[PDB]
Amino acid sequence: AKSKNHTTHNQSRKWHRNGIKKPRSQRYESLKGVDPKFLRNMRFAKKHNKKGLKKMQANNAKAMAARAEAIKALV
Amino acid sequence: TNTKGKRRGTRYMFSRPFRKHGVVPLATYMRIYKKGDIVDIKGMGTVQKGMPHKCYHGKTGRVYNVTQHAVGIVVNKQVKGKILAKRINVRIEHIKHSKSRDSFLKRVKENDQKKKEAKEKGTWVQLKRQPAPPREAHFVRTNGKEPELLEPIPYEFMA
Amino acid sequence: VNVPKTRRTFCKKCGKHQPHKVTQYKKGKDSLYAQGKRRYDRKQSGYGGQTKPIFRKKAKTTKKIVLRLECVEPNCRSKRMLAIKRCKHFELGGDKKRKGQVIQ
RNA sequence: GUCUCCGUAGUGUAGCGGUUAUCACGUUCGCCUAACACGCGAAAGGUCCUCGGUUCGAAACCGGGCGGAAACACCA
RNA sequence: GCCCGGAUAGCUCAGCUGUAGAGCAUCAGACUUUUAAUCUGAGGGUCCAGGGUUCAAGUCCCUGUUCGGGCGCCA
RNA sequence: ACCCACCCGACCCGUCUUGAAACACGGACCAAGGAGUCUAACACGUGCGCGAGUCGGGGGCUCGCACGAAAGCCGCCGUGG
RNA sequence: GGCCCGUCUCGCCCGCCGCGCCGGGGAGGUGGAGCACGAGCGCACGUGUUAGGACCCGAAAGAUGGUGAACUAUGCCUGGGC
RNA sequence: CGAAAGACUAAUCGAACCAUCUAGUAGCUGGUUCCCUCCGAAGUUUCCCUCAGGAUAGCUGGCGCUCUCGCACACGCAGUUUUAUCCGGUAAAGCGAAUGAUUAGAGGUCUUGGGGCCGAAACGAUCUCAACCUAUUCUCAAACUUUAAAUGGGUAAGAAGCCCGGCUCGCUGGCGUGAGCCGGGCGUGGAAUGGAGUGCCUAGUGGGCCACUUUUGGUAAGCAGAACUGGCGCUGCGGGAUGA
RNA sequence: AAGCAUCGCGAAGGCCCGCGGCGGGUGUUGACGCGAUGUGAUUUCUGCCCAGUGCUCUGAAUGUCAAAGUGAAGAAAUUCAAUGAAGCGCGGGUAAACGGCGGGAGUAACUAUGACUCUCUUAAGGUAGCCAAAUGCCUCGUCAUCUAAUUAGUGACGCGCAU
RNA sequence: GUGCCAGGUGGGGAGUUUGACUGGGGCGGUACACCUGUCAAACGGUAACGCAGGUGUCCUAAGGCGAGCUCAGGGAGGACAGAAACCUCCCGUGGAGCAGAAGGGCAAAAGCUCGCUUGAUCUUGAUUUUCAGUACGAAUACAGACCGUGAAAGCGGGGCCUCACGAUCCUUCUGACCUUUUGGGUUUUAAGCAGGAGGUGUCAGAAAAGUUACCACAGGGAUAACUGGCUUGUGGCGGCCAAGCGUUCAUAGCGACGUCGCUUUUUGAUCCUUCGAUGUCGGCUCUUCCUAUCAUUGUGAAGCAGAAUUCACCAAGCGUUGGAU
RNA sequence: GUCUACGGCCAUACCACCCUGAACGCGCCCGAUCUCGUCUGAUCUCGGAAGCUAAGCAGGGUCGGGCCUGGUUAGUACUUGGAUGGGAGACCGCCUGGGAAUACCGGGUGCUGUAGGCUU
RNA sequence: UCAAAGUUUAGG
Ligand SMILES: [Mg+2]
Ligand SMILES: [Mg+2]
Ligand SMILES: [Mg+2]
Ligand SMILES: [Mg+2]
Ligand SMILES: [Mg+2]
Ligand SMILES: [Mg+2]
Ligand SMILES: [Mg+2]
Ligand SMILES: [Mg+2]
Ligand SMILES: [Mg+2]
Ligand SMILES: [Mg+2]
Ligand SMILES: [Mg+2]
Ligand SMILES: [Mg+2]
Ligand SMILES: [Mg+2]
Ligand SMILES: [Mg+2]
Ligand SMILES: [Mg+2]
Ligand SMILES: [Mg+2]
Ligand SMILES: [Mg+2]
Ligand SMILES: [Mg+2]
Ligand SMILES: [Mg+2]
Ligand SMILES: [Mg+2]
Ligand SMILES: [Mg+2]
Ligand SMILES: [Mg+2]
Ligand SMILES: [Mg+2]
Ligand SMILES: [Mg+2]
Ligand SMILES: [Mg+2]
Ligand SMILES: [Mg+2]
Ligand SMILES: [Mg+2]
Ligand SMILES: [Mg+2]
Ligand SMILES: [Mg+2]
Ligand SMILES: [Mg+2]
Ligand SMILES: [Mg+2]
Ligand SMILES: [Mg+2]
Ligand SMILES: [Mg+2]
Ligand SMILES: [Mg+2]
Ligand SMILES: [Mg+2]
Ligand SMILES: [Mg+2]
Ligand SMILES: [Mg+2]
Ligand SMILES: [Mg+2]
Ligand SMILES: [Mg+2]
Ligand SMILES: [Mg+2]
Ligand SMILES: [Mg+2]
Ligand SMILES: [Mg+2]
Ligand SMILES: [Mg+2]
Ligand SMILES: [Mg+2]
Ligand SMILES: [Mg+2]
Ligand SMILES: [Mg+2]
Ligand SMILES: [Mg+2]
Ligand SMILES: [Mg+2]
Ligand SMILES: [Zn+2]
């Protein structure tokens, strides 16, 4: 009593009932499996972003004032 | 039932082409992949360290990691019913920049040129592409000489 | 295979690399008052015949050889197990084979 | 057909990868004897079945060739 | 695995930490008309392998490789 | 809806099976009987009550129980889960 | 990004009735059925999965305790028959 | 118990009968009770003392939720195609290209031979057949190939995109990289179609078979075994007289 | 089945029952007996094989061999040691115990067979007998006989698949 | 002697076991765990007891660096020296070598020869491959230690790449001034925690011999032993071609080397039907059909003088017997 | 025009033989005290600068081989999809789109980056 | 005070 041994006959059909969906792409994928030495350093960089805040805020206010002067000169 | 061995059936795939054996010429090594570079994988026989598996040869995907002398590269591999985006660590020698994306960037650059200009002019320009339309109305001058008649030729047995 | 009797490899205790004496490892005598043996003793007792299985179907014909790497620097002497691939010949310090010589 | 083993001077056999290939008989040549036999002393003789491989090296280890010989071929 | 034994010259075997015994076999001398048989001498031991104890080991010691009679058997 | 006629259609059901009208099995006929239950434990879903709580058991107090072996109440209201 | 427990690596300081092979913290990884302004508890119905006779019917067997030699098997006692 | 046949032991004997344990166990036969409605399979996966069964994926249903907008004011997704761009070593082709096979004559003392004939003998003369070689030539390859299709498989075709300004780093470093952060500035970016996403419970199934084309074993088979799609199984209806 | 032949036992015994007993059967018995096996009247024979598996005999000369007992060290659980019963090994016997019982070459003044020789081999290598038998594959063996005709019957033959 | 322990003996007795796949089973194989080339239909993936093979190891270097070289083969030379010894010049895309099967890869190397070495060491995670996208094994990229080597850039955590291997439980070894050993303390002991080893080859891992013709039960046409289907290799019968035979003459009768068919009175394949049973050989008896015609009727042919004859046509009306084993 | 040093792509760059090379280079070349290394100053290392382009190197040449690129081969071979097309089969023709490979015949025979020379 | 030692034209 020998069987059928293997096949792939009805399988494509079976797969395509429910699509063959592409793998759901997000923005902001994880940093799992990224070269450790990198990840330390981007972690440290992220740690000290709040250091150098007061400088950054002022720079944007100076930029915003320069934009407001430019738009007044245009109008 | 076939053997599950890693390199089964790559007699031809991983085999340097005709009269291109020997030293892996150096541009190959010394060109830079960043994150998110579109990259097509193509295994190579000379370099056996960091070889991709025979399933990812031909396949294109994006770079996610870059180590000292290899590049982590997300590629989509189908499995019966489900496409699995998965991340593989190929050594540079088995990898090129895929040009597929550059022709796109060329077009967007050309669009940004054609958007900046034609704004002060006022005349809006076709930025979208369009498929090859039917080939328009036109005259054909049979200049002096008439058409050439083509009789089909009588059969004969050559061999 | 052949391996030499001295080995300058890592020593955990010291933290460095250090020379170690090498020797092939052996199973010790079997306690008798291990919980296992104490358990089997009081199970296997009485009637019931034999209670746990007995392996009678030997497939392989060689052991993974293990070396017992002992640290040379005193004030440490730290022993360490170090396995090697299976081989039906093994020895320690059995000549250096000699390239480019007459066989007779 | 399967699985097994064996192919070595003329004959029957030994042979643990490095041999002058072992032993007995047979063969030739002396001697002894009147002659023969026995006997004594010497000698000669192997395609190590065939081819290819592994080996620094194969009579052997490994593959196939051509032979030879046992066991199996059952339930209807 | 545990106990025990053998491994010595071609072979079989002695050997009590200070030219390695016996017998056969091997080769040269007698005897033989010669051979065999037998009597004399001569040659031939990595004392299985390695390390130690020891002033000194074939032996004592340990460790292996064998050997081969019993014991034994939880992945 | 009873009977008859005619034209066309139309093999016997059940079942196992890739395949049953089968030269596959079960079945003469009728009546009654006749097979996914209950308990426990888990999980998810749904409905209700209360909600950082919730809970009811077990026990007790109220009755001879007609209805009650119910119903009600408990610094036990929380030992405890 | 952060915090808690396990664990590793590297480091530098604190504490006191008992200065100790005492106790406490830091940085960076990494294991945890974790935390990051709670969602559970009780009751009821449904489906599924199990353990139970467990959808209904079905063995060959296995075990305990009892009944039979009125048939037949063999022995013995006492009679009969050729 | 047996003058032995496994004979006989109350029509029962290769282990009597009665009651109980007992509703013994069964991956195996058989059966399994009203209507309409809606959706609707599988015989393939890996593991299993597994191959008449399970497990696990798959395929089914049920319950939903989260959003979308025909309420003149849409994003995303696809058993397509288009435009770019990689991948390939099958068909074919090739063997005056490698590997291996293989025919023929030309040419060649290449080598050298073994056999000759004429030579004592002599690359002397003359043939010859061996292998080798110089151009040619015949015919081949699932486990050969310089070439090389068709059909085919990736990517890409924008707001998660571009373009400016500045901050953070214990990484990297002549200065710079590269990454991560803030803050602004810019909109339809090929065709065709379609509302999408997402989570829980979950049954049956895990004997298959048939045809086009491709395809292995076999003289072949209504034989055995794969690929590809579509059937039958689950399905009636017109045709093929009859019929999966 | 008679007949033949082995084997155990002198009774605190052989053989056997029984759950147990200063239990029971053989046995109200004693080797011309009880018990266990084979073969199968008579006649005539009963070859060789003790390597194998059995059974049995001997036993400090002795390898291993348990519990207890003896010593040992340890704080003790303990470990280690020496000691050492039967049994295995070691050595004899036994086939009317289970059973077993060969293969090459050459050789005789026609040829053929092979008395004879040579080897290689086992524990021996199948003896007396017997035979295509109720035992022989090839097989419907060959010769004879019996029949007009015989895959049958009988008598002979014997490298006899496989007496 | 009895009582209780100890060791031996013990199919007298008990209980139980006695794989799988498989063109029925058994016998044989292993297609049971792996690897190469092919099968495979130019991504991947794919079957059969398909094809051709390999694996249970080997290596102290055949691992790791760095240096220097160049290999097979051939030509032409040189005392003994010849086809082969050693030296020297030339050519040499690898035709060698790289432990092993094959495939790939490899030349100031991945080959050979030296020098120095232990990266075959210690430790987190990520990933790939089989995949369910679990394990094992095998691999890839990093990261942290401690080293090696090189002037250095670098390379190296085994073997150029694709195979060489093994869970829970138990044991054993190694590891930390580690935890527990429970009323507390000290010490042995044991128990934990973490990593190696002792193996399950039926290789995701029972501990396991037969026989039954005295047999049983659950089932199976998922599967054999008949018929019948398909097929026709094999058997049977028949063409075509025409080298020969036939004194002479291919073809009166024949017919090689080749070739095309039919047939189901042979045997195989196969397993569709039937296992809640289709009575399993032969003979007897009886009927009917077929023709591929032995005889009989009518005819063509001859190597037909007659007689006897074979070859062919129409043709199955009628026949085709008695015995020995 | 051209070279040297380090190159990228790796024959349009290879091989064979032939010719020509001003200047600067690059070489061959002459030595072994020292560095370094050989059986050997051949190579390797080092110190030089008398000769010479003989060679390497460059540029050219050849009805050259080779390679590169077109044609032809050929809408041929093959092939996606189609039919109740043919054919006893084997196979073939059509529709629908895709479409090769030798032999044979042409053409071509390195381009170029950085840094520094020379032809002032 | 006992080893082993077989054979011998047809051709007068
Ligand atoms: Mg199946
Ligand atoms: Mg006991
Ligand atoms: Mg069934
Ligand atoms: Mg069926
Ligand atoms: Mg039906
Ligand atoms: Mg029918
Ligand atoms: Mg039935
Ligand atoms: Mg009926
Ligand atoms: Mg009813
Ligand atoms: Mg709920
Ligand atoms: Mg559930
Ligand atoms: Mg139930
Ligand atoms: Mg029952
Ligand atoms: Mg039972
Ligand atoms: Mg019974
Ligand atoms: Mg029931
Ligand atoms: Mg089953
Ligand atoms: Mg639905
Ligand atoms: Mg292929
Ligand atoms: Mg082809
Ligand atoms: Mg089923
Ligand atoms: Mg079938
Ligand atoms: Mg069905
Ligand atoms: Mg007897
Ligand atoms: Mg005996
Ligand atoms: Mg017998
Ligand atoms: Mg006889
Ligand atoms: Mg008769
Ligand atoms: Mg007779
Ligand atoms: Mg039994
Ligand atoms: Mg089976
Ligand atoms: Mg394909
Ligand atoms: Mg080198
Ligand atoms: Mg190597
Ligand atoms: Mg490292
Ligand atoms: Mg106490
Ligand atoms: Mg019988
Ligand atoms: Mg039978
Ligand atoms: Mg019987
Ligand atoms: Mg059937
Ligand atoms: Mg003729
Ligand atoms: Mg049939
Ligand atoms: Mg009937
Ligand atoms: Mg006719
Ligand atoms: Mg010089
Ligand atoms: Mg020059
Ligand atoms: Mg010149
Ligand atoms: Mg040219
Ligand atoms: Zn140490």
Short mmCIF file of C-alpha atoms (C1' of nucleotides) and ligand atoms in Angstrom, two decimals, chain F residues 12-16 20-22 24-25, ligand 5:
data_model
loop_
_atom_site.label_atom_id
_atom_site.label_comp_id
_atom_site.label_asym_id
_atom_site.label_seq_id
_atom_site.Cartn_x
_atom_site.Cartn_y
_atom_site.Cartn_z
"C1'" C F 12 -32.19 2.06 -5.34
"C1'" C F 13 -31.62 3.90 -1.14
"C1'" G F 14 -28.07 4.20 3.05
"C1'" U F 15 -22.74 3.97 3.16
"C1'" C F 16 -17.04 3.55 2.82
"C1'" A F 20 -21.53 2.98 -6.82
"C1'" A F 21 -27.48 1.62 -10.61
"C1'" A F 22 -23.32 -1.82 -9.60
"C1'" A F 24 -19.28 -3.60 -3.27
"C1'" C F 25 -21.72 -4.45 1.74
MG MG M 5 -25.15 4.60 -3.62
#
